[PDB]
RNA sequence: GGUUGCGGCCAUAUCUACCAGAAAGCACCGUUUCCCGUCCGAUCAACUGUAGUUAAGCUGGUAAGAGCCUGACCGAGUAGUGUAGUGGGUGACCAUACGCGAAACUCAGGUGCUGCAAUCU
RNA sequence: GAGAACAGAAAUCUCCAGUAGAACAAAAGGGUAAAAGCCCCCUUGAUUUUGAUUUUCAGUGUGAAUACAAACCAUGAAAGU
RNA sequence: AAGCUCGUAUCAGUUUUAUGAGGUAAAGCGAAUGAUUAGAGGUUCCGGGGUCGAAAUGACCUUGACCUAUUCUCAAACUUUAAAUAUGUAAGAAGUCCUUGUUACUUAAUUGAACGUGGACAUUUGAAUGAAGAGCUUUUAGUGGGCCAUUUUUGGUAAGC
């Protein structure tokens, strides 16, 4: 068993997901997709660090789980459990097939799950404080050791996971049009109804500091 | 204000669900004939239930729709045997209300020893005058928001008329 | 004569299936039992 | 195992447009076709009677016969080493007019007009269309428009 | 009431046609009425459109065009009191008189009035207008009822019989006129003559005047105001019939307070829309009004 | 300019909440003799326009409204794609040359127009 | 969803919301809302005479289908079908 | 191969202009269907487990479920939108306009439909470029094992499959 990712590496077939036409498939090895203090706020974690792909390929579901464990173990052992939020941004939906006389009736049974990753697609995202740049970079270096292909650790200059680079997020927050939701934020738009905009964002519609 | 939108009784429905077919259902139909003065219509099952002992396309219930002065006198007799107290639930949120009586000998006809005992469900609906706009065929519509009688309007009307009282909630 | 009349159902389903609102798991236990 | 029915591979072809289901309209019922008109065939999925084959979808032909509820359209189709003429009996919901044909009629009316004046004033007609001639000599004013210098941007990653 | 419909629902929502949405036309029926045999290429299909409001009867001859339906002739029950009928403008006799009026008006307009005189001896018998040999064929219109029920004893079929007696070749059967007893499967000429000449109103008047003075008075105030007796309904309805046979030409009203005065003064209470700066001013005023965390 | 009847395009017209409607019209409305129809004059049929009402229907307005429509040099000449190279790279794939060229997003505007006939302070 | 004796999760009756999330004999796709769905009334166009056309195609056959013509009918107030 | 009728206004493995058609690449899921990660708020309506005076057709809760607004990722047999390349038709003389002839078709009709008579339409007869000719017919051979390359792509770990 356990054929190589070198024989399941490239994107050669059409996406073959679990549907009403493809049943009795095995479940993936990765079940948890967010690790660390997943209830924290974007005000708590400003710096974003991305592990991004540079090849068009297929990452195994179990490669995802193995890299997720080694990353989370290193970060928790070094900087504690509440110092980071790790989110895996690819989900294994492509069912990979195995053949197991001759090539007559060669259509195979489902074997595993894989996530198709494109060039410039984020695989891992970690948000953290400004001091933990070294430990986040080292943990994602272990993750890129365990994934196949060539990957890049980039310092994402967006406040947390969302959008809106750090000067822009500052100006929005001390303007007051940002409301703290669970693990994310809500924004004030100038297109909603006035009544619910008032009763959802009082700080913008007051003279508060 | 209140020019003509006061209230009125649209119809009263008498419903008996005997749960089986034959002599019992026919005798229930005779009870409805003698009470309303009007031919009853027998309602039919929808699906089989093993615990209920019912079969699909088997005649289960029987009901009569009455309107107007006969509706109000039947309502008066039903409220008289229900001693003019109704439990607030008993006034659904669209304003229409209803109750249920057992041993229908308490109102009207004597026993007629060949028919039997049949409890029945009174259900009454009310409308402000002008429900033809949502009932008629050409140029249909919906009643406005200063219409479509609510629970508070119905209980206010039912405490103004009939000298009745309500319960806790 | 006892004239007989049927209710014309305004329903299209002809399957002998109860609706999904008839789940026996959905049941109000601690319903008031008759004493 | 293999099927070639009348409506094989016609799923998205005979679907209706989005928010365009239901009854087809009385303009398409009251437009008139006379023998010799040139029409375009695009099947309407709601009317199953009189529907064409999938080959003739989006195809242009000359009407030759006009009857009670349908018209007959002559379509040239390519099979083998020759074109064959085909005589389809299609209903007026699947038949629509050809805006190339109406614009050709407006152009022949305009040409007849232009030759009528050019004969009245004795000037040459210049009737046929000319394609896009390249350009001509021009002067551009710098007054109020000084050329702003552009330079290639460096590489900054946005993610 | 928390039943507000979602944005996805409102996006996938296909609105019906305008007239279906306002519930005035049946497009299935409209299609089948106005679709023409394509081998005629230009001949309009003419509809005898009959409509009934609560106080008026509208009877029109309509043809169909891509730009919109156009009217060839019109006749109104509120124009009937010019002829002879000052009361009961929505009864069976008004329907028959309106059908007669619309038939005679369109034949006078089309110049087919010297021939196709119609009946002139109205007797309540069912006949079709036969084509005159060596001459123009009768004008063919099809009855457009619309949405009302095609029950036996309908004023739209009263107008149908009025048009058929007026001379318009309406294709019809006799199993919808009143007096058609399905047990005997024939027509009743006496009952249908009574219905044409308003006999049911007359028996109603004599029954009320015999039994209840207050109900007779309440329903028939204008009748007693004109002092019109219970047995003169046939006299006035006949005289209206020959007045229609005399002058089926449209006389418009006095038209006082002309069109520009109607536009200028009679309608100025329509409230005008605002523009962008006024809308922004109201928004800013509401911002100032709702300023603070109150 | 309204309103009615018939319509054309079929959301710029729909949906939700709230206001206004002088005239006429429309509507709600009253009655069961007849034709007729229902378990039921509620729908439908018939009679009166009288006893009343604009409460609804309808029409129009408002909403930093939902939706829908139009536009933009907003995104974006981006993704994608024809054609070419003894171009690159172990490959995956990418760049260039000559052409074509989106969708989402952002922002701005708008919220039915019109044909025939009749009627209206 | 809110209600009405027994009656409850679900038996029957109402009201409101409900762009089709149902049904259309069967596999899947398409289509359909005053209908093509569900009830009621009448019927036998599931008829006769041969032709033309489309699909597979050699532009042969078989099957299926389309539009007419000359009849005779059904239905409906009728247009029509 | 034999030709034949014309070499008289006929065509094109091509482009433009005008007008159609399509649902693939892309894109989308805070748009339908299906999949799917994570929190937030609410349901004085007990779905399940409790606690508070064994009580509660009572409160304090946990926890599901459901709903509302968000959020991460997708789909050959999902889709609002939607390319590029290929694809249909047209670019007059067998055409257009004006009066009036036939008809058992059609119309309410001296109205229409189809085919016509007569008259008008030259140094641009109505886009480009080409034509080493256009069209048609007869007869008959051999063939009816294929293979490779760029791009798209199916099955397979892959293959000089
Ligand atoms: C210019 N000439 C040489 C010519 C050429 C062609 N064909 C071409 O254009 C060439 N063919 C190519 C395009 C190369 C395939 C042509 O096709 C023609 C003609 C001549 C005309 C002459 C016509 C003429 N009248 C009507 C002006 C005439 O006198 C008669 C007659 N009444 O007998 C004709 O024969 C004429 O009508 C005619 O037939 C011509 C051509 O067809
Ligand atoms: C389009 N041009 C090339 C053309 C085409 C055709 N034929 C066609 O339209 C095509 N043939 C079809 C009908 C489609 C089978 C044509 O038939 C003609 C012509 C040209 C004309 C020119 C005529 C012209 N007129 C104004 C009198 C002229 O000056 C003379 C003359 N008297 O010298 C002509 O030669 C002319 O009469 C002529 O022969 C033409 C055609 O016949
Ligand atoms: Mg020649
Ligand atoms: Mg010539």
Q: Is the CB of D154 under 7 A from strand G?
A: no
Q: Is the CB of D55 under 7 A from strand H?
A: no
Q: Which residue is nearest to nucleotide H95 (CA to C1')?
A: D108
For residue A13, give the nucleotide whose C1' atom is nearest its CA.
H154
Q: Look up residue E142 and give its DSSP letter.
A: E
How far, in Å, are B130, B138, E20, E23 from residue B141 at the CA level?
11, 9, 12, 9
Contact A153, A137 (CB under 8 A): yes
Q: What is the DSSP string of E54-118?
A: SS-EEEEEEE--TT--EEEEEEETTTHHHHT-SS-TTSHHHHHHHHHHHHHHHHHHHT--SS---
In Å, what is the separation between the CA of D123 and the C1' of H114? 40
The CA distance from D97 to E66, in Å, is 14
Smallest Cα–Cα separation from A90: which of A55, A54, A65?
A65
The CA distance from E209 to E227, in Å, is 14
Contact D40, D62 (CB under 8 A): no
Q: What is the Cα D48 distance to its own chain's centre?
A: 24
The CA distance from D28 to D37, in Å, is 15
For tokens 């005189």, what's the residue? E117
CA nearest to E22 within chain B: B139
For residue E36, give the nucleotide whose C1' atom is nearest its CA.
G79
Q: Nearest 5°: phi and psi at A151?
A: -125, 165
- Give the number of beta-carbon pairs within 8 Å between A and E: 15
The CA distance from A15 to E54, in Å, is 66
SS3 E266: helix
Interface residues 65-84 of A with strand H (CB < 7 Å): none
C5/B49 touch (CB, cutoff 8 Å), yes or no:
no
User: What is the dihedral sign for C-alpha D120, D124, D129, D130?
Assistant: negative
Interface residues 228-287 of E with strand F (CB < 7 Å): 250, 252-253, 255-257, 259, 261-267, 269-271, 273-276, 279, 282-283, 286-287
Q: Is the CB of E37 under 7 A from strand G?
A: yes
- Give the number of beta-carbon pairs within 8 Å between A and D: 7
B15, containing H or E segment: strand B8-17
Contact D88, D52 (CB under 8 A): yes
Q: Is the CB of A130 under 7 A from strand F?
A: no
**Per-residue tokens: C34:** 């008759």
Q: What is the DSSP string of D73-111?
A: EEEEEEETTEEEEEEEEEETTTEEE-HHHHHHHHHHHHH
Smallest CA–CA distance, residue E20 to chain B, in Å, is 9
Q: What is the Cα A157 distance to its own chain's centre?
A: 16
Centre of ligand 3 to C-alpha D130, Å, is: 28
The CA distance from B42 to B28, in Å, is 10
Contact B97, B86 (CB under 8 A): yes
Q: What is the DSSP string of chain A?
A: ----TTTS-S--S----SSSSS-SPPPPS----EEE-TT--TTT--EEEEEEE-S-EEEEHHHHHHHHHHHHHHHHHHH-SSSEEEEE-----EEEEE----STT-PPEEEEEEEEE-TT-EEEEEEE-GGGHHHHHHHHHHHHHHSSS-EEEEEE-BSTTSSSBHHHHHHHHHHT-EEEETTEEEE--TTS-HHHHHHH-TTTTTT--
**Per-residue tokens: B27:** 């005798």
Residues 6+ apart with CB under 8 A from C4: B42
E278, containing H or E segment: helix E276-289
Contact E179, E193 (CB under 8 A): no
Contact B164, B82 (CB under 8 A): no
For tokens 């034959």, what's the residue? B22
**Long-range contacts at A140-147 (CB < 8 A, ≥ 24 apart):** A140/A49, A140/A51, A140/A71, A142/A67, A142/A70, A142/A71, A142/A74, A143/A51, A143/A67, A143/A68, A143/A70, A143/A71, A144/A51, A145/A70, A146/A63, A146/A66, A146/A67, A146/A70, A147/A59, A147/A63, A147/A67, A147/A123
Q: What is the Cα A141 distance to its own chain's centre?
A: 16
The CA distance from B152 to B78, in Å, is 22
Q: Nearest 5°: phi and psi at A117?
A: -115, 135
In Å, what is the separation between the CA of A131 and the C1' of F14? 55
User: What is the dihedral sign for C-alpha A196, A201, A204, A208?
Assistant: positive
How far, in Å, are D71, D73, E269 from residue D98 at the CA level?
15, 13, 48
Q: What is the DSSP string of E155-208?
A: HHHHHHHHHHHHT-B----STTSTT-BTTTTB--HHHHHHHHTTHHHHHHHHHH
Q: Which residue is nearest to nucleotide H97 (CA to C1')?
A: D112
How far, in Å, are A4, A5, A114, D28 from residue A29 at the CA level?
16, 15, 10, 59
SS3 D72: strand
The CA distance from A111 to A58, in Å, is 14
Q: Is the CB of E70 under 7 A from strand F?
A: yes
Smallest Cα–Cα separation from A83: which of A46, A45, A139?
A45
E20, containing H or E segment: helix E18-21
Expt. technique: cryo-EM
Smallest Cα–Cα separation from E168: which of E80, E123, E109?
E109
Smallest CA–CA distance, residue E48 to chain D, in Å, is 19
Centre of ligand 3 to C-alpha B30, Å, is: 99
**Per-residue tokens: B146:** 């200063």
E148/B138 touch (CB, cutoff 8 Å), yes or no:
yes
The CA distance from D77 to D85, in Å, is 7
Smallest CA–CA distance, residue D159 to chain A, in Å, is 6
């Amino acid at each position: 068993a356990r054929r190589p990712a070198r024989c399941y590496r490239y994107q050669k077939n059409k996406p073959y997901p679990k549907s009403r036409y493809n049943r009795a498939v095995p479940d993936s090895k990765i079940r948890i997709y967010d690790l660390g203090k997943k209830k924290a706020t974007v005000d708590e974690f400003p710096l974003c660090v991305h592990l991004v792909s540079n090849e068009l390929e297929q990452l195994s579901s179990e490669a995802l789980e193995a890299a997720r464990i080694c990353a989370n173990k290193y970060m928790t052992t070094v900087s504690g459990r509440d110092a980071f939020h790790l989110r895996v941004r690819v989900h294994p939906f492509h069912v990979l097939r195995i053949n197991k006389q001759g090539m007559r009736g060669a259509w195979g049974k489902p074997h595993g799950l894989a996530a198709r990753v494109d060039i410039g697609q984020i695989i891992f995202s970690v948000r953290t404080k400004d001091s933990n740049k070294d430990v986040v970079v080292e943990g994602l270096r272990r993750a890129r050791y365990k994934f196949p292909g060539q990957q890049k650790i980039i310092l994402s200059k967006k406040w947390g996971f969302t959008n809106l680079d750090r000067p822009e997020y500052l100006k929005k927050r001390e303007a007051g049009e940002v409301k703290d939701d669970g693990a994310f934020v809500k924004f004030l738009s100038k297109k909603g109804s006035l009544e619910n905009n008032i009763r959802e964002f009082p700080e913008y519609f007051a003279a508060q500091a | 204000q209140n020019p003509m939108r006061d209230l009125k009784i649209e119809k009263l429905v008498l419903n008996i669900s005997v749960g089986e077919s034959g002599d019992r259902l026919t005798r229930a139909s005779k009870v409805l004939e003698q009470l309303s003065g009007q031919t009853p219509v027998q309602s039919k099952a929808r699906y089989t239930v093993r615990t209920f002992g019912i079969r699909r396309n088997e005649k289960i219930a029987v009901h009569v729709t009455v309107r107007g002065p006969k509706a109000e006198e039947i309502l008066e007799r039903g409220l008289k045997v229900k001693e003019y107290q109704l439990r607030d639930r008993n006034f659904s949120a669209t304003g229409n209300f209803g109750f249920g009586i057992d041993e229908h000998i308490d109102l009207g006809i004597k026993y007629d020893p060949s028919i039997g005992i049949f409890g029945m469900d009174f259900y009454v609906v009310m409308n402000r005058p002008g429900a033809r706009v949502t009932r008629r065929k050409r140029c249909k519509g919906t009643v406005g928001n200063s219409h479509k009688t609510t629970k508070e309007d119905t209980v206010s009307w039912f405490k103004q008329k009939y000298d009745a009282d309500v319960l806790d909630k | 004569p006892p004239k007989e009349i049927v209710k014309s159902n305004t329903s299209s389903k002809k399957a002998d299936v109860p609706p999904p609102s008839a789940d026996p798991s959905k049941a109000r236990k601690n319903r008031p039992r008759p004493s | 195992g293999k099927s070639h029915g009348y409506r094989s591979r016609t799923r998205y072809m005979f679907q209706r447009d989005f928010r365009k289901h239901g009854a087809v309209h009385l303009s398409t019922y009251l437009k008139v076709y006379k023998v010799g008109d040139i029409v375009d065939i695009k099947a309407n999925g709601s009317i199953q009677k009189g529907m064409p084959h999938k080959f003739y979808q989006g195809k242009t032909g000359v009407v030759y016969n006009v009857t009670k509820s349908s018209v007959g359209v002559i379509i040239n189709k390519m099979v083998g080493n020759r074109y064959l003429e085909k005589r389809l009996n299609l209903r007026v919901e699947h038949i629509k007019h050809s805006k190339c044909r109406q614009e050709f009629l407006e152009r022949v009316k305009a040409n007849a007009a232009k030759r009528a004046e050019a004969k009245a004033q004795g000037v040459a007609v210049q009737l046929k269309r000319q394609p896009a001639q390249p350009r001509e000599s021009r002067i551009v004013s710098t007054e109020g428009n000084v050329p702003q210098t552009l330079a290639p941007v460096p590489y900054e990653t946005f993610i | 009431q928390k039943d507000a419909k979602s944005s996805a629902y409102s996006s996938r929502f296909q609105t019906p046609f305008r007239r279906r949405r306002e519930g005035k036309t049946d497009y299935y029926q409209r299609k089948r009425l106005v679709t023409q045999h394509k081998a005629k290429y230009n001949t309009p299909k003419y509809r005898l459109v009959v409509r009934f409001t609560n106080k008026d009867i509208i009877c029109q001859i309509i043809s169909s065009t891509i730009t919109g339906d156009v009217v060839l002739a019109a006749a109104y029950s509120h124009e009937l009191p010019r002829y002879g009928i000052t009361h009961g403008l929505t009864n069976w006799a008004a329907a028959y008189a309106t059908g007669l009026l619309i038939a005679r008006r369109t034949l006078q307009k089309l110049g087919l009035d010297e021939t196709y005189k119609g009946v002139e001896e109205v007797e309540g018998e069912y006949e079709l207008t036969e084509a005159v040999e060596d001459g123009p064929r009768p004008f063919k219109v099809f009855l457009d009822i619309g949405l009302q029920r095609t029950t036996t004893g309908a004023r739209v079929f009263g107008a149908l019989k009025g048009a058929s007696d007026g001379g318009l070749y309406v294709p019809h059967s006799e199993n919808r006129f009143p007096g058609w007893d399905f047990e005997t499967e024939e027509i009743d000429p006496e009952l249908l003559r009574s219905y044409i000449f308003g006999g049911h109103v007359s028996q109603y008047m004599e029954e009320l005047a015999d039994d209840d003075e207050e109900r007779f008075s309440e329903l028939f105030k204008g009748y007693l105001a004109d002092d019109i007796d219970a047995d003169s309904l046939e006299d006035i309805y006949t005289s209206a019939h020959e007045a229609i046979r005399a002058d089926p030409a449209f006389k418009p009203t006095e038209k006082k307070f002309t069109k520009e005065q109607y536009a200028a003064e009679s309608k100025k209470y329509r409230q005008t829309k605002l523009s962008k700066e006024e809308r922004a001013a109201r928004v800013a005023a509401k911002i100032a009004a709702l300023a603070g965390q109150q």
